Amino acid sequence: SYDRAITVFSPDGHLFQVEYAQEAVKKGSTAVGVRGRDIVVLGVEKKSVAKLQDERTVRKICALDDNVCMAFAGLTADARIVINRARVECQSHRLTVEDPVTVEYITRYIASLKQRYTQSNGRRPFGISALIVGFDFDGTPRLYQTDPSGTYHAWKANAIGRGAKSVREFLEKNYTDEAIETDDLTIKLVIKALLEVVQSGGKNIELAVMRRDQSLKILNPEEIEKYVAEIEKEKEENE
Amino acid sequence: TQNPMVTGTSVLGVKFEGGVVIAADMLGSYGSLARFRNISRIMRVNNSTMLGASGDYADFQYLKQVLGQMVIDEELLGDGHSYSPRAIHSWLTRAMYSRRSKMNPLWNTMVIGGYADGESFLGYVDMLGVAYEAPSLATGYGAYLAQPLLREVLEKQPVLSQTEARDLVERCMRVLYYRDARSYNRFQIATVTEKGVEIEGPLSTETNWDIAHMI
Amino acid sequence: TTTLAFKFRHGVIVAADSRATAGAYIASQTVKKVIEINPYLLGTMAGGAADCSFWERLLARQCRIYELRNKERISVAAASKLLANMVYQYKGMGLSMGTMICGWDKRGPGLYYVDSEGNRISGATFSVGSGSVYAYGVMDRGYSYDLEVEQAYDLARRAIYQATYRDAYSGGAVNLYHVREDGWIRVSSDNVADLHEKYSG
Amino acid sequence: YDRGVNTFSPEGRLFQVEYAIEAIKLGSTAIGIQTSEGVCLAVEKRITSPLMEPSSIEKIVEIDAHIGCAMSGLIADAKTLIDKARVETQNHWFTYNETMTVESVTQAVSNLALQFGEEDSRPFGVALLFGGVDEKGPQLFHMDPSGTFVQCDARAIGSASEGAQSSLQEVYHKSMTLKEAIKSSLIILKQVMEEKLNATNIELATVQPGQNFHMFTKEELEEVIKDI
Amino acid sequence: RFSPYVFNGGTILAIAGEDFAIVASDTRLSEGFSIHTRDSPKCYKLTDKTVIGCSGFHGDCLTLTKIIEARLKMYKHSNNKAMTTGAIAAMLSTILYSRRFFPYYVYNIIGGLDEEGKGAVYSFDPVGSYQRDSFKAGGSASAMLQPLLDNQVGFKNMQNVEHVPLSLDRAMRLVKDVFISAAERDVYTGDALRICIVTKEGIREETVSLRKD
Amino acid sequence: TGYDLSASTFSPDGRVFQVEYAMKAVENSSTAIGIRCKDGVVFGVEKLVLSKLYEEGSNKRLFNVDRHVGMAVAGLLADARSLADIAREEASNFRSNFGYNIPLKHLADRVAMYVHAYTLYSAVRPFGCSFMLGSYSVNDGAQLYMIDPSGVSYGYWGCAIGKARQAAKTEIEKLQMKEMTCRDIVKEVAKIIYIVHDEVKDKAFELELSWVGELTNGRHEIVPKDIREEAEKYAKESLK
Amino acid sequence: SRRYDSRTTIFSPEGRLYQVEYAMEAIGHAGTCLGILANDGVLLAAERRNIHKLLDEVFFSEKIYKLNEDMACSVAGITSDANVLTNELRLIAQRYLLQYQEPIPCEQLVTALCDIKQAYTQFGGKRPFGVSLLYIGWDKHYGFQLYQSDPSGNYGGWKATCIGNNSAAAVSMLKQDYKEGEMTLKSALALAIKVLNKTMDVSKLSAEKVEIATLTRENGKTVIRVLKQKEVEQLIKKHEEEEAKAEREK
Amino acid sequence: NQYDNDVTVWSPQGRIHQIEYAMEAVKQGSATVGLKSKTHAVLVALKRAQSELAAHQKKILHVDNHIGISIAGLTADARLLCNFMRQECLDSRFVFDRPLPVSRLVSLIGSKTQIPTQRYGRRPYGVGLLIAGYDDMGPHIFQTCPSANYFDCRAMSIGARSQSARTYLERHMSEFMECNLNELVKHGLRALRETLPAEQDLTTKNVSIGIVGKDLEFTIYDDDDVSPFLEGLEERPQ
Amino acid sequence: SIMSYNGGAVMAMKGKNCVAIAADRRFGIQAQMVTTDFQKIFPMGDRLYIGLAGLATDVQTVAQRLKFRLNLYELKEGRQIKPYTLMSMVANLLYEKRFGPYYTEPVIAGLDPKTFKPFICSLDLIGCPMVTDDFVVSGTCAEQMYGMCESLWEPNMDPDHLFETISQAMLNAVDRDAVSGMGVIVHIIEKDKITTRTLKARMD
């Protein structure tokens, strides 16, 4: 190994590199996620396709189990390592314990790995922040987030990446319980949040949902077009 | 050691008033052939305690080496503190037990005799780690042959003199010369008091054979 | 040595004897064989005292760790799985262990059977020991699922009485534990001679 | 790099440990009070968003059936310490059929509060309050990053701990009762917090010798708050 | 070849009273068809309320006694208080299983007081189980002593015999009678008797001779 | 200034300044001399009481490594203790591997290699010790060696380690060293130690004298200096 | 001991990364490669570094490495630094084939090499593999494929790739001359001839300064065609006839 | 000042200043005093607290049946060397079945603390040991240092403002040798009441006393067998 | 024996300008057969085969390991492998398990990669090579195939008589054998082409 202190404290009581490795997350792509009562929804923005290539390998949303889903921001390689180890961990949990994997267990593993990885001798911290969405115990929807420190932190909706303060400001006018909680209206409202992004080109939107019993469904950018059209229709009804 | 090559034979030791006398013979038999008829089987440890052993002689050379180095180290500490004979007994018991726990036993049968601080000491260490104190010890076939003489006279007389102890040892070694096949008419007497440790020379026995003139 | 266990509509019955011999010589008459792992688990002693006692204590330690880490009580299958994985790592070195695991689950009743040979299996009735076959006979006479409570008490008590009556390596006090949804409850500790006077006629 | 992990001062102690004692200060506050009736304990969560679900943030964790806890500042290192401390107390139950008493718990923690080592890893940035009920009655225990473990009767940590310790020294004595100490703590809490006190800010953790189980108050805490 | 075990024999007794724990043992140490000594007490005084006896192979007895003493000092020097009786029993069970696959050839009996101040006898096996019983006889003369203790202590197999709590001097005459009667027929028993009594006021010892053969 | 930091680096003029700084560390230490006679080697260390806080018989720098070998260290005491432990270990290996007494040349060369191995790398510092080694043997005579902090180890008749390194050997070498038995050399070392620094900078000192040779029959021990009391009845005659 | 430590894996004082950006700027000054959009087959193009006349050219391959049977790879950057990577890549693919007796489906191969590179991005504190390199291949699950490794560990599955400062204008020509549907390999070869005609400073495109290798599916074989020089010569003559066709607008 | 950073670097004046910094870190501990009679050895330390409500940080801790140590400086190194001390005691108590002589134990402590004073990668141990024990030749009062140059005395005192204590030990070291336990202990606190400023007086809860005797086992005391020790005093000479 | 656990017989025969290798088809447990299509002659490059006989575990294991090392060699160097090189590789692979030995008797038969020169050799279960000029045999039955080939071999053989000779040898030596039977596969290779024929053997 390398016997040196990548972790040193500040003269005023900080960690120079963990809060600062959050900046690499802060300068990555945006991704949101909410829970409905029966259907959970998330998606990433900024596919940033050069219109003439493939994109099926750059997918930032994958799965570890048939119950749980991933998301991240920041740089993608640390996400790839964490996802590989997370697949291994969920399957090793399936080896002993015969349950479907609880979301809280795999988040504790990810956060525990992240903190004992940052603690050790000469290993660069993972500059990601994951979103771990699943519904296992009696179909109860849960979504947790991470941090480069390794703090799993359960929410009901979330916004990360570039300009997440703005996205959460849209989420402020979106924190009503009603908002009618339909599947199409909640998904399209998430779509409207991704529409409140810095560019909102209309074709770079990628969203995937899970209805707490099925598997992952990759959508088709015509249903989202009708979602955007009816969002524009409701915006016209405001006038 | 699984198979002892060159074995000794029985060792006798007994306390008396302010001292312990130990005598063992000087034979190095291999099988039945008395191959090494001039060897030393008693180590005179530094100034108080004193060692005599049985079984494989090479292992006794090894423990002589190790104990010599330890005694040299404490004497070079210069603190004025030495090993009590009971401490040596404890170390030797732990050494033999840790040998046999690893299934590599030291084939020996050891007797530790010492006189320190007014009190005599006579300790025993077996190969298997069985270790105890006794007013009179007898190893090998000595526990079968010269032990009841020791236990007879110590029951008959609880205290002793130095002369009575030495005479009784002389008689027991004569008897062991009479009917041990692994025995030899040459033995040395070693004695500790408060005056130091003394190794006597290669004494012998005076025998009788007047039963042979009968048919 | 003869233990049994069977689950039914109202939970799980566990009974055992209390004789533990040594070859042809009986050591004690009051060996509490059903090792109380938790307020919701009961382990037994089935072949060997030290192995069953030690490994069930280690399993109880592990279960308490699991509960204190997840704030949620362990299942039965998980405990049997952990026990089988811990026992499997000394296979062939001479461990004799045939214990049983009983408890209440999210699914409800749970009954598994873990050997030192590693035959972790589910089921509804089990019986371990030298005279286990006698218990199998009279139990599979009297077995149903829709039994009452005192009927099941009489079934287990009669079964252990017949087993200790025929086998030579079994005897002593008949313990009787009852696993419920909330927790297990000791019923009674009955001697053989009392059952002989009561059930001989 | 301006004197890293392995150097004293010209006048005093080590740099990094002093910087850890500085590092505690950014954490949220917590107050535990030893009382002969039992140990009580309280904390502030510092919730930012309404999305930030209140019952998921942990400050009081469950060490044993009669041992509580409180942490500071950094969360995950504290969770690691909690995990291994639980393992070692469970090891005590394994080899002793009994409860590792709270002083022996914190000695087992502070054997490696400072075992920080990168060669032959960093010191930890958390101050911990431990409460429990041993055979000598209740106990309240306070440790630090430096391992300087001491018994405290009613310790306050973290942010704004100066006025908390002062105004706690104003009201504390030896013959306190339970509920008086509970409300006397939460008065200090709503003097040191910044928001209005309601059901989701704070959480209580009380352990009694006869009520060893359930080191928590769940939404009777609302009734406790409305009594001021 | 070299065999790692040998049978040294011995007989250790324990009786759990209402507020006392009597542990007695002969001090004969033998091997095969010889006598090594007539003074080797199997009893050992650990604390003010704990006496352990160890029979069987003698070297393992010495090693186990010293390791238990070391761990007693470790608990005391770590946690400012002595161990209980059951903690020592649990620890000894962990030790006897910690050398499972190379066993001690040692019978073990721990007597002592609990935390309520009552008698408690914890038996053992060579491999590491234990249980809290009222009376045990360990070693070669176990079977010569267990049914008589079943007759007298347990009042078993009797009719119209009420249960009197076992007093002290009655237990003393019991111990003397059972060791004389067992020393008549055993070959591994005699030449002395070291009786240890644990009360709420300390440890007593007592030396009673026997027959000299 | 730039090159005296590490113990691995060389200088623009070609030497290691760490070794020099460790050599002049021993310059502030107590004065320790030694001299041999025709049947033995005598040591002597000018040892000082602090003010009034000592006990006259603690922490003696005259060690005793083997049955016939001891050290006469001066400098940092704990480093000398560790080095003495290494020397005891090396004499232990030789006695354990060959069954007889260690020759002093081989012992000194092994110790010099150990010191050199601590002078090479950058992880470790050079030693802050400089010590003496005496011996006697029936087939070899008296041997007196000398080890610097660098590791240069060769032999002397007499030496001195401390402040008055020159100022002792100014009048050490005018001793008729061959024709004297060591029983004269006892009061000779007494007068040499008593000459240097009676009262000028410090207040009081105290004498130790080590002693090996034929007169000890091959043993090494401190003299019974109180027996024959040879310093003071000659020290009071050495001031005039 | 602690004053000889470079940064190696430590973040910047402004929020960025050091060895990754400097590895990319080590990539940009190297040889230019590319592959094309072709369905029934896929190709590679490569530029000869060190075109001095006193070489041997007896290796048959300077940028291509025929790695398993149905996969090759181009490369750009430090050479033996990549040769170690080719050794490990082939060894990983061959132990995969050892494990299953079925050829490697090429994306877990790409993730294997990317995680090898990533392991020296986080810990180890060594010089990162400052080499980007291509991938061609075939499978049972997607057919013909193209992939692009990077020193960060990110890989994109491309259909028309990108190498450094000499090839940004090449990718601009790839987008302004995007093709889809025409899988005819000769059209793609004419396109690549056009791309390296603009981008390379080789005057009039000497064939000694270029290298082209293709990979077609033949009956059950998936042969890799490291083609010879004469067909390159007549391809260039075809392309310069197409330049005459381009100046038919005069 | 750029050579004064690490343990490996010798200074150009030869004084390794990391050792001096560890010494000054020892000088910022609590006051403690150790002294022996011909038959009894008594060491007395001083406790301090962070605030009024908290308990006092203890200094005198138990080691073995006849060995007890005082301490000043850091507490992590204190408990580290404590665990090593108990381990090395029970090792020889296991092997040789005897109590340890004190001199070889303190030599092993010095040989233990040598390694963190010579290689690169460990700090010198901030530690303030005052060791009392019983070999065959009576009580011993040893002290250590972070430079591992352990001393034997008849009466020492280390910690903050401990020099007036040393003056007291100078002017009563002749009187120390003859007396029994009681006036010896009150000489010890007639050093500790000068380790304090004069406008306050030594109370119960801040002082600790540990006696080991040639027939007496080592025992620590706190406030209750110290209320007998605190009476038998006069006021300071105001 | 352990060699007679699953049966097996491999014959290779060198002709004039070509080489012929043949083996049996039977797979089964000690007395119970299972299938008639078990492969024991493996292609290792062009115009060069290898045959494996003995325990089927070591047959498939050594075949996959050898294919592993063979492709690593043929990828580090673009040329194809000479047979002596393959022989030394098989010797090294078997000799790595000197004390953990495989139960196999590999037989290598191939042509020259530059010329049309044939090659035969055989090895033992520890890595003892043996090059000859006429024929090598392996498997359970030995003396049968030795008697047949020492009865039927001629030095200069057109491939047709080579085929008929190895055909008659395999048919008669298999029909005399008990545990190895149930069909014969024959590979007769040369510079121009590769022929694989299956014979109508007695299914008894």
Swiss-Prot record, chain A:
SMART domains cross-referenced by the UniProt entry: Proteasome_A_N (SM00948)
Assembly and interaction partners: The 26S proteasome consists of a 20S proteasome core and two 19S regulatory subunits. The 20S proteasome core is a barrel-shaped complex made of 28 subunits that are arranged in four stacked rings. The two outer rings are each formed by seven alpha subunits, and the two inner rings are formed by seven beta subunits. The proteolytic activity is exerted by three beta-subunits PSMB5, PSMB6 and PSMB7. PSMA7 interacts directly with the PSMG1-PSMG2 heterodimer which promotes 20S proteasome assembly. Interacts with HIF1A. Interacts with RAB7A. Interacts with PRKN. Interacts with ABL1 and ABL2.
Domain of life (superkingdom): Eukaryota
Post-translational modifications: Phosphorylation by ABL1 or ABL2 leads to an inhibition of proteasomal activity and cell cycle transition blocks.
Modified residues (N6-acetyllysine): 226
Gene Ontology biological process: proteasome-mediated ubiquitin-dependent protein catabolic process
Family the UniProt entry places it in: Belongs to the peptidase T1A family.
PANTHER family named in the record: PROTEASOME SUBUNIT ALPHA/BETA
Principal location: cytoplasm
UniProt induction comment: Down-regulated by the ribozyme Rz3'X. Up-regulated in colorectal cancer tissues.
UniProt organism field: Homo sapiens
A GO MF label: identical protein binding
Pfam families reported for this sequence: Proteasome, Proteasome_A_N
GO annotation, cellular component aspect: cytoplasm; cytosol; extracellular exosome; nucleoplasm; nucleus; proteasome complex; proteasome core complex; proteasome core complex, alpha-subunit complex
Phosphotyrosine found at: 152
Subcellular location per the Swiss-Prot or TrEMBL entry: Cytoplasm; Nucleus
Keyword Flavoprotein (UniProt): no
Cystine pairs: none
Keyword hit for Heme: no
Protein name: Proteasome subunit alpha type-7
Glycosylation site residues: 129
Curated annotation (Swiss-Prot), chain B:
Protein family membership: Belongs to the peptidase T1B family.
UniProt induction comment: Up-regulated in fibrolamellar carcinomas.
Alphabetical GO biological process terms: negative regulation of inflammatory response to antigenic stimulus; proteasome-mediated ubiquitin-dependent protein catabolic process
Subcellular location: Cytoplasm; Nucleus
Organism: Homo sapiens
GO-annotated cellular components: ciliary basal body; cytoplasm; cytosol; extracellular exosome; mitochondrion; nucleoplasm; nucleus; proteasome complex
Chief place of localization: cytoplasm
Record function comment: Non-catalytic component of the 20S core proteasome complex involved in the proteolytic degradation of most intracellular proteins. This complex plays numerous essential roles within the cell by associating with different regulatory particles. Associated with two 19S regulatory particles, forms the 26S proteasome and thus participates in the ATP-dependent degradation of ubiquitinated proteins.
UniProt keyword Membrane present: no
Superkingdom classification of source: Eukaryota
GO-annotated molecular function: lipopolysaccharide binding
Coiled coil: none
Protein name according to UniProt: Proteasome subunit beta type-4
Keyword vocabulary terms for this entry: Acetylation, Cytoplasm, Disease variant, Host-virus interaction, Nucleus, Phosphoprotein, Proteasome
Residues bearing the modification Phosphotyrosine: 57
Curated annotation (Swiss-Prot), chain C:
Positions annotated to bind bortezomib: 49
Keyword Protease belongs to the record: yes
EC nos: 3.4.25.1
Keywords recorded for this protein, A-Z: Cytoplasm, Host-virus interaction, Hydrolase, Nucleus, Protease, Proteasome, Threonine protease, Zymogen
Compartments, as annotated in UniProt: Cytoplasm; Nucleus
GO BP term (any one): proteolysis
Annotated GO MF terms: endopeptidase activity; peptidase activity; threonine-type endopeptidase activity
The keyword Nucleus is annotated on this UniProt entry: yes
Subunit structure, as described in the record: The 26S proteasome consists of a 20S proteasome core and two 19S regulatory subunits. The 20S proteasome core is a barrel-shaped complex made of 28 subunits that are arranged in four stacked rings. The two outer rings are each formed by seven alpha subunits, and the two inner rings are formed by seven beta subunits. The proteolytic activity is exerted by three beta-subunits PSMB5, PSMB6 and PSMB7. Directly interacts with POMP. Interacts with ABCB1 and TAP1.
Family under the similarity heading: Belongs to the peptidase T1B family.
Protein name: Proteasome subunit beta type-5
Swiss-Prot record, chain H:
Biological process annotations from GO: immune system process; negative regulation of inflammatory response to antigenic stimulus; proteasome-mediated ubiquitin-dependent protein catabolic process
InterPro entries: Ntn_hydrolases_N, Proteasome_alpha, Proteasome_alpha-type, Proteasome_alpha1, Proteasome_asu_N, Proteasome_sua/b
One Pfam family matching this protein: Proteasome
Residues with PTM Phosphoserine: 107, 174
Cross-link Glycyl lysine isopeptide (Lys-Gly) (interchain with G-Cter in ubiquitin): residue positions: 112, 205
Main location: cytoplasm
Single GO cellular component term: nucleus
Keywords, ordered alphabetically: Acetylation, Cytoplasm, Glycoprotein, Immunity, Isopeptide bond, Nucleus, Phosphoprotein, Proteasome, Ubl conjugation
Glycosylation sites: 107
Molecular function via GO: lipopolysaccharide binding
Subcellular location(s) of the protein: Cytoplasm; Nucleus
Induction of the gene: Induced in breast cancer tissue (at protein level). Up-regulated in liver tumor tissues.
Superkingdom in the source lineage: Eukaryota
Complex formation: The 26S proteasome consists of a 20S proteasome core and two 19S regulatory subunits. The 20S proteasome core is a barrel-shaped complex made of 28 subunits that are arranged in four stacked rings. The two outer rings are each formed by seven alpha subunits, and the two inner rings are formed by seven beta subunits. The proteolytic activity is exerted by three beta-subunits PSMB5, PSMB6 and PSMB7. Interacts with NOTCH3. Interacts with ZFAND1.
Family: Belongs to the peptidase T1A family.
Record protein name field: Proteasome subunit alpha type-1
Gene it is expressed from: PSMA1
